Design a protein around this ligand. Structure first.
Ligand SMILES: Cc1cc2nc3c(=O)[nH]c(=O)nc-3n(C[C@H](O)[C@H](O)[C@H](O)COP(=O)(O)O)c2cc1C
Ligand SMILES: Nc1ncnc2c1ncn2[C@@H]1O[C@H](COP(=O)(O)OP(=O)(O)O)[C@@H](O)[C@H]1O
Ligand code: SF4
Length: 669
């Protein structure tokens, strides 16, 4: 069944004293389930072993109480009581013949060490990089350095006892004491661990050697290493210290795991990166080391993956997000079913939950982080109770499509109707806005699976009244009629219409989605939504030749993007396009050719010229038909009716897919 062009992806690879059955490798990625939610972690990782990944890796595994990103729950290996708990994780992974790796981590000056109210560590005192907590990262003694190597070595020993095949030395993401020691912007020491490169690399070398001596006979020792830091010009570049660290340690480890420093550049959103964007930065690594190299590039194309290997860029196809979206990517290629891959769209909604220290989710794969909590599998569904039962789904958005898909798979008779000429509801027009193109795979994935199933009927020019739905006499109606952007500026900090909101120069995202743009001149985009829709309209408008000012009541542009790791890229994008950024500012009133605004801190007022105004403040549900159907139910017709997605409540597309799956699994129980 497998096309032999992919044979190379399934060759085993020797990684020190162990071997992986294939080249599909799941790189360390946090799930925000810790020791506190073992079953979540177990069920999560099991699915990726089940799906045929040759290595499945545990995320940053804390080696000591002085290292956490609290309140994010992480694995821990700083105490023997954690061995048996993690042995279960290993067992659920090694069961399907995947290897089991663990990213042993010490966060240095990247976390507040709050869980055990401890002092975080640094080569040189500073507040933590990503935390405002009033706790300083302390300058460490030589005796503290000796203790740190003890912790690493001892955590490596604990990992061996747990049965991990691959034990990491972590120097990446600016979330490592080792990277802090490397970085001249952080290390200001004047002893033998500071000054010239030999001194700055000493801690990374001395650690790596200790772990190799500790567990190297039977466990492979991996290094995860940021070759370039793209955050600021710290001089940790692939040409400089990135290249030097490799050269110095080139054939010391059994595996080089290599990426770019700062998460926002590593887990690059599809708005700003495409596949194998890291190639230029890690390209050099295989010329320096004889050792197997694993890299990442949001790899989704099997031909991209083949090419990465053939052209000598990588030995191993590194993945996090692709493995989240399709735990089964490996088993589908192996079955000649690469057409059925569920492709990551790079929305970083997985990132967002994890950076609000909550359980992981996926826009594409609702099962991600629900394996234990809900009993949801990536591919398998319970058989349809009474297969002859029929369901009418009203709405061609991601909610509708996910419900139809899910019911179809269980084996039910499924009809789906939409009023438009193209499947995707809100995504028909959203996917055509600048840098939102990849989000169309939410629609494509589901259409392509649905239209090859004989139990599914797809009607694409079918606006339905309440009469039409009764007539059809389905056993169950799901209403997924989506929502609309409203235009009175109400939805977050305004309960009351903004004065002048009904002036004809005032627009909503609906107009921009329909390509009805102001001809030119100045335009104010007012963001009370705090996600991508306002930043995206701004981009669209600047590119049409309008002078855009982006205005929010929030302290930061598009606040939620702190969590999708897009803030720094949206801002840089806006600076480059000469899009004005105004913050901590509300609109008092809208006049014919200007808006009055107020600064929130102190109420300093201002007039801004504005030939047009886009209000991005929230969505209102299209739920009339759903209420007509409940009112309509006389006992005779439509006894079973539910609503799902934006028509139930507005939210990110991930929520439309979650509702869709939930309806699909709950029906008939
Ligand atoms: C939700 C999430 C959690 C992550 N957690 C970690 C982590 O704990 N340690 C780490 O080194 N990298 C982490 N990463 C980075 C990934 O390992 C990977 O390097 C990055 O996502 C690029 O690969 P991709 O394009 O396949 O996602 C995480 C990424 C995501 C999306
Ligand atoms: N009465 C109706 N009959 C058919 N399709 C409808 C009806 N009312 C709304 N729709 C369609 O349903 C879809 C709503 O989906 P969407 O806005 O993407 O929301 P969601 O995120 O909930 O899926 C749109 O294509 C919309 O035009
Ligand atoms: S959430 Fe968006 S990004 Fe994270 S995995 Fe699912 S699809 Fe890829």
């Amino acid at each position: 069944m497998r096309d032999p062009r992919y044979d190379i992806l399934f060759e085993p690879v020797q990684i020190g004293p162990v071997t992986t059955k294939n080249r599909f490798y799941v790189v360390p990625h946090a799930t925000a389930m810790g020791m506190t939610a073992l079953e979540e972690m177990i069920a999560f990782r099991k699915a990726r072993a089940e799906g045929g990944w040759g290595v499945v890796c545990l995320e940053e595994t804390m080696i000591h109480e002085t290292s956490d990103h609290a309140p994010l729950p992480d694995p821990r290996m700083y105490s023997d009581k954690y061995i048996e708990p993690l042995a279960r994780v290993v067992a659920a992974v090694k069961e399907h013949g995947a290897l089991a790796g663990v990213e042993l981590a010490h966060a240095g000056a990247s976390g507040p060490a709050i869980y055990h109210r401890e002092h975080p560590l640094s080569p040189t005192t500073k507040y933590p990089h990503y935390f405002i907590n009033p706790i300083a990262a302390r300058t460490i003694d030589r005796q503290d350095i000796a203790d740190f190597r003890r912790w690493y070595r001892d955590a490596a020993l604990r990992a061996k006892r747990a049965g991990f095949d691959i034990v990491y030395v972590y120097c990446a993401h600016n979330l490592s004491l080792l990277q802090d020691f490397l970085d001249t912007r952080v290390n200001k020491r004047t002893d033998d661990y500071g000054g010239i490169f030999e001194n700055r690399v000493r801690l990374l070398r001395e650690t790596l050697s200790d772990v190799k001596d500790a567990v190297g006979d039977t466990c492979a020792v991996a290094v995860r290493f940021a070759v370039e830091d793209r955050r600021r010009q710290t001089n940790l570049t692939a040409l400089e210290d990135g290249r030097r660290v490799v050269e110095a340690l080139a054939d010391v480890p059994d595996l080089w795991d290599v990426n770019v420093s700062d998460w926002a550049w590593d887990s690059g959103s599809s708005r700003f990166f495409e596949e194998g964007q890291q190639e230029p930065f890690i390209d050099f690594v295989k010329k320096v080391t004889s050792k197997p190299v694993v890299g990442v590039g949001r790899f989704t194309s099997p031909d991209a993956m083949v090419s990465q290997i053939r052209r000598g860029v990588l030995d191993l196809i590194g993945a996090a997000r692709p493995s989240i979206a399709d735990p089964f990517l490996p088993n589908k290629i192996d079955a000649g079913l690469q057409d059925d891959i569920r492709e990551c769209i790079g929305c970083n909604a997985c990132t967002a939950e994890v950076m609000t220290s909550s359980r992981i989710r996926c826009t594409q794969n609702p099962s991600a982080g629900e394996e234990h909590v809900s009993g949801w599998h990536p591919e398998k569904v319970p058989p349809a109770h009474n297969s002859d039962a029929s369901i009418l789904v009203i709405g061609g958005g991601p909610a509708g499509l996910e419900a139809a898909h899910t019911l179809a798979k269980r084996g039910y008779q499924v009809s789906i109707a939409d009023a438009g000429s193209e499947w995707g509801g809100r995504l028909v027009r959203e996917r055509r806005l600048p840098r939102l193109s990849a989000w169309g795979r939410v629609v494509d994935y589901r259409v392509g699976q649905l239209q090859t199933m004989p139990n599914v009927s797809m009607y694409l020019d079918s606006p339905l009244g309440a009469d039409d739905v009764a007539g059809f006499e389905a056993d169950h109606v799901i209403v997924a009629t989506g929502a609309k952007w409203r235009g009175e500026g109400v939805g977050r900090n305004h309960d009351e219409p903004i004065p002048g909101c009904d002036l004809p120069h005032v627009l909503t995202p609906e107009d921009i989605l329909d390509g009805r743009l102001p001809e030119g001149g100045s335009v104010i985009v007012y963001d009370e939504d705090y996600y991508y829709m306002a930043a995206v309209v701004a981009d669209r408008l600047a590119r049409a030749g309008c002078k855009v000012t982006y205005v929010t009541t929030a302290s930061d542009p598009s606040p939620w993007t702190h969590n999708t790791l897009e803030m720094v890229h949206v801002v840089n994008s806006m600076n480059e396009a000469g899009i004005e950024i105004v913050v901590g500012t509300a609109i008092a009133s809208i006049g014919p050719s200007s808006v009055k605004v107020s600064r929130l801190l102190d109420g300093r007022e201002n007039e801004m010229a504005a030939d047009a105004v886009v209000l991005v403040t929230g969505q209102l549900s299209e739920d009339e038909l759903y209420h007509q159907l409940i009112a309509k139910r006389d006992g005779g017709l439509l006894r079973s009716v539910e609503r799902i997605g934006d028509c139930l409540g507005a939210g990110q597309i991930a929520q439309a897919t979650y509702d869709g799956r939930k309806a699909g699994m709950r029906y008939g129980t």
